[PDB]
């Protein structure tokens, strides 16, 4: 567990967990992009579009955005499993696949932004308001957390004529 209980990696998985909660709130908060035609303002989200002035109501209307976000969440609950079973039975190596999963999570979530971004270009004003910055920060959190955890799990660049990756401890 020498790489499984380091402080520099425990802080990274802490940042990973913060990214997880920000991504879990960015997928359900359908109030992350406002439209301003001008007194019928609509709040966008990956699932439900709402209207406000009186007549408060959300509905649906680009399946790509929500589907890809679901893919990202699937990567999250695929990666956290292998992450937690890395603490038992000397299974430290498992920290490497988990990290990569998290990385891809971010990537998928990232393109979600893009596609929704593109949708915002087809419709009035626009102001990414509440959970858009949440997702923009969740992407960076998950992406850099995955990358940093991956490098902290991979042993080290040899740096000596005798050292080598894939050594005997």
């Amino acid at each position: 567990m020498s790489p499984t209980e380091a402080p520099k990696v425990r802080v990274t998985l802490f940042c990973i967990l913060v990214g997880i909660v920000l991504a879990m709130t960015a997928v359900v908060s359908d109030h992350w992009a406002v439209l301003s035609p001008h007194c019928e303002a609509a709040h966008f989200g990956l699932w439900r579009i709402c209207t406000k002035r009186g007549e408060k109501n959300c509905s649906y209307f680009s399946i790509s955005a929500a589907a890809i976000s679901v893919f990202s969440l699937g990567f999250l609950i695929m990666g956290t499993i292998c992450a937690l079973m890395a603490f038992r039975k000397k299974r430290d190596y498992l920290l490497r696949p988990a990290s990569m999963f998290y990385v891809f999570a971010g990537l998928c979530l990232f393109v979600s932004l893009e596609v929704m971004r593109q949708s915002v270009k087809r419709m009035i004003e626009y102001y990414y308001s509440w959970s858009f910055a949440c997702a923009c920060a969740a992407f960076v959190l998950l992406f850099l957390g995955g990358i940093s955890l991956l490098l902290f799990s991979l042993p080290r660049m040899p740096q000596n004529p005798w050292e080598s990756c894939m050594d005997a401890e």
Partner: protein
């Protein structure tokens, strides 16, 4: 006389470097009344000391055998201009040999007269290698005169001066492709002269690829072997508050208090982000002001630099040039860290040793600037239309023809323009020779010096085609010779500070640890494992990688394009899941190559279904199939070792790359301050793509000037004539008041500074590897020891420590160097 002929030399060299175009008549006479005084003082000095010394034992010095020549040649023109042999520029020869007496400055420096003791064996002994470079240029000029000789018969009025028509003009056109300056436009004329980008046409690119890829190579064997086997022998002959958490916390605040300075809009007087970063400025000054009196509570060059920065950042909580002096907010981090200061003194001690080579290169540039002033004094004027040759003629309006069409004309006022980089005084001459020294824009000065007519007359097409000599001797003797001996000076002052083979090998044998192989149990899975480690399987995977790459280059502009992508995705998925089964996910995730393969496999799988999700009812996700090419370098050990020994040294010295990063930050901020309100307009080099409006654009402009793009035209794109941005705040009437002349110091310095730091980072990384680079691959070394580790871990699959006495048969499996 050790300080009495120094004065005569100085008063001669200061009168020789005060001539300029349009000098007043009294200076014209003072340089004629004094030109003979400082010659008579030289003949009495070659007299009143020769008699006291001798007449046969005085010519023995190659030093003093030249001091007589200056007088023997000077006495000519005094009693030669009293002749009817006026010869307007024939007297310019007698004037260009007058500055030949500028070499007396070299004599008065022991180093300046000892460095050449081996340089006389540098060029003169190895002028045979400098001859083969010329024999190469002459072959490629004759091949150019065949390929593109007289084929530039274009039906437009566009001018193309770098062509292959005669020999003196093909030599110039090859030298320029060799110095890699604007060579990409000499290729587009060669490609358009044939057909265009057709099939035959584009194959003339080879001529311009072999001439640069194998012409520079020889150039790295000519002017480098001259400066590392001969600048080494010269040196051989010369031989014979106190808690750590507070520091770790406040060091994170100068970074933040710097990033709050950088990402600040410079244009608008009152912007939304301007006041927020002012609030953060005061909120960070209110924190840094507690660390100083604390440093003065526990107590009473490096400890005093934290004070003036807050002093000149809080006074206001002219008026702007102090904000330029607050860009050193991150310059107070050199004391909090260790290596950040341990590198600064190594760059300040690396300058003292290289101080001698930067003094002879400034006198050589000042000697070549005087020649330029005599040759091209005032000849660099021109008119709007090339048909008017004097300033009385170049007045009124004239027609310009768009598209060279005689029936589509525009009226333009004609004006007597003066080239930006000229040779009127010695300062402007030194500026122009500088921009030629960095190889930027030197052909546009060449083809303007070739066309120079007279002292106040416009150019004449191909008037003096011999002037190229001046621009080809200066470029060989400074940009090719002095620059490489300076790099060699750095590389040999770095090489001193760094048996030996026996010591390395015993250290290796002392600190080695074997390799885990994880050969598996359970023969039912051992049969799967044997088929994925056999050489045939690895070579099949290599072949599959190359076939996928060749399948990736087939695509063009204007399906069978994705069925093979899915085929390869599934094949590389299967060779991963089967390898997992063969390693049981405990040995698979050990080898980093397998982690990389896993990453790429799942990435390509995500892309192959991300496209199908869209096509059922993210461009970068397709890059994961391209990156499969890197995984084939896990077999080429000869490339892997080189890459590793250089990435190993690029990571063990980050505190020198942090120097370049801090330099870029400082200069980006100062640039955003000084010239950041210049408007954006096409036709200038300050446009929507290259400007100082934001911070990333300033850093990109600086990275552009670093690689050496047309930085000399940005330097002129911001120099007190410019139109300030509309949305900026200014006074009425002051539109064409933007940009400052301080730019001349902003760029000229930056380049020079960045020329040093980079070289710094380039030699450290090299000297750090001086054991690998200089290693005879035939005798003995750690590659054989890695072979030993391999064959040992073969009989010792798991780590297991040391192994049983007999299985010794591995010594039967070792080859001579260890036998």
């Amino acid at each position: 006389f050790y300080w009495l002929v120094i004065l005569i030399v100085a008063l001669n060299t200061l009168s020789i470097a005060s001539e300029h175009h349009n000098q007043p008549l009294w200076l014209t006479h003072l340089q004629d009344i004094a030109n003979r005084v400082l010659l008579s003082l030289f003949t009495i000095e070659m007299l009143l000391k020769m008699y006291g010394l001798g007449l046969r034992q005085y010519f023995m010095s190659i030093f003093n055998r030249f001091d007589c020549f200056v007088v023997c040649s000077g006495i000519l023109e005094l009693l030669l201009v009293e002749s009817g042999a006026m010869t307007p520029l024939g007297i310019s020869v007698l004037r260009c040999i007058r500055l030949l007496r500028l070499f007396k400055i070299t004599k008065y420096w022991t180093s300046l007269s000892n460095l050449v003791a081996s340089l006389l064996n540098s060029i003169r002994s190895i002028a045979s290698l400098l001859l083969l470079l010329f024999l190469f240029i002459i072959i490629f000029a004759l091949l150019g005169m065949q390929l593109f000789g007289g084929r530039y018969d274009f039906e437009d009025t566009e001018v193309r001066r770098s062509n292959f028509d005669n020999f003196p003009q093909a030599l110039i056109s090859v030298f320029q492709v060799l110095t890699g300056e604007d060579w990409n436009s000499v290729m587009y004329n060669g490609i358009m002269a044939y057909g265009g980008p057709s099939y035959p046409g584009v194959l003339v690119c080879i001529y311009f690829i072999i001439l640069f890829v194998c012409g520079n190579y020889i150039l790295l064997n000519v002017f480098l072997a001259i400066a590392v086997d001969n600048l080494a022998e010269a040196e051989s002959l010369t031989s014979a508050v106190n808690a750590t958490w507070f520091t770790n916390f406040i060091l994170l605040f100068i970074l933040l208090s710097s990033a709050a300075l950088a990402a600040e809009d410079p244009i608008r007087a009152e912007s939304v982000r301007n006041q927020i970063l002012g609030y953060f400025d005061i909120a960070f000054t209110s924190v840094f002001t507690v660390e100083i009196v604390l440093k003065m509570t526990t107590y009473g060059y490096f400890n005093i630099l934290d004070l003036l920065v807050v002093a000149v950042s809080l006074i206001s909580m002219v008026v702007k040039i102090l904000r330029v002096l607050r860009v050193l907010r991150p310059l107070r981090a050199i004391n909090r860290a260790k290596g950040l200061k341990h590198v600064v003194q190594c760059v300040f001690v690396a300058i003292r040793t290289i101080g001698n080579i930067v003094l002879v290169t400034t006198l050589l540039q000042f000697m070549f600037a005087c020649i330029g002033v005599q040759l091209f004094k005032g000849k660099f004027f021109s008119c709007n239309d090339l048909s008017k040759m004097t300033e009385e003629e170049c007045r009124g309006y004239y027609y310009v023809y768009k598209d060279g069409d005689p029936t589509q004309m525009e009226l333009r006022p004609r004006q007597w323009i003066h080239n930006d980089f000229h040779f009127d005084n010695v300062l402007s001459a030194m500026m122009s020779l500088f921009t030629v020294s960095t190889f930027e824009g030197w052909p546009q000065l060449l083809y303007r010096a070739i066309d120079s007519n007279e002292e106040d007359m416009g150019p004449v097409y191909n008037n003096r085609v011999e002037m190229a000599i001046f621009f080809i001797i200066y470029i060989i003797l400074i940009a090719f010779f002095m620059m490489n001996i300076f790099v060699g000076f750095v590389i040999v002052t770095f090489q001193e500070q760094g048996d030996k083979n026996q010591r390395q090998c015993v250290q290796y044998a002392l600190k080695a640890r074997p390799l885990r192989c994880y050969i598996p149990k359970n023969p039912y899975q051992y049969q799967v494992w044997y088929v994925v480690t056999s050489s045939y399987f690895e070579y099949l995977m290599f072949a599959l990688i190359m076939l996928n790459t060749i399948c990736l280059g087939m695509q063009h502009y204007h399906h069978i394009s994705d069925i093979l992508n899915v085929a390869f995705t599934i094949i590389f998925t299967l060779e991963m899941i089967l390898k997992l089964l063969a390693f049981k996910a405990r040995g698979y995730f050990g080898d980093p190559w397998n982690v990389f393969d896993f990453l790429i496999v799942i990435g390509s799988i995500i892309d192959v279904i991300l496209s199908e999700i869209d096509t059922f009812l993210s461009a970068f996700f397709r890059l994961f199939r391209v990156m499969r090419l890197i995984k084939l370098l896990s077999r080429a050990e000869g490339v892997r070792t080189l890459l590793w020994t250089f990435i190993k040294s690029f990571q063990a010295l980050p505190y020198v790359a942090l120097l370049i990063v801090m330099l870029f930050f400082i200069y980006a901020v100062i640039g955003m301050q000084m010239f950041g309100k210049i408007a954006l307009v096409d036709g200038t080099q300050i446009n929507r793509n290259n400007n100082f409006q934001t911070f990333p654009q300033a850093v990109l402009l600086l990275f552009r000037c670093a690689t050496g793009e047309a930085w000399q035209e940005i330097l002129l794109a911001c120099s007190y004539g410019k139109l300030c941005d509309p949305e900026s705040d200014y006074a009425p009437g002051e539109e064409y008041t933007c940009g400052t002349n301080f730019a001349y110091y902003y760029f000229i310095s930056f380049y020079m500074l960045c020329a040093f730091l980079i070289i710094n980072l380039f030699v450290a990384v090299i000297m750090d590897n001086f054991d690998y680079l200089t290693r005879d691959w035939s005798i003995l070394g750690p590659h054989h020891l890695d072979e030993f580790k391999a064959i040992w871990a073969e009989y010792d699959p798991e780590a297991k420590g040391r192994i049983k006495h007999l299985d010794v048969t591995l010594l039967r499996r070792i080859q001579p160097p260890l036998g």
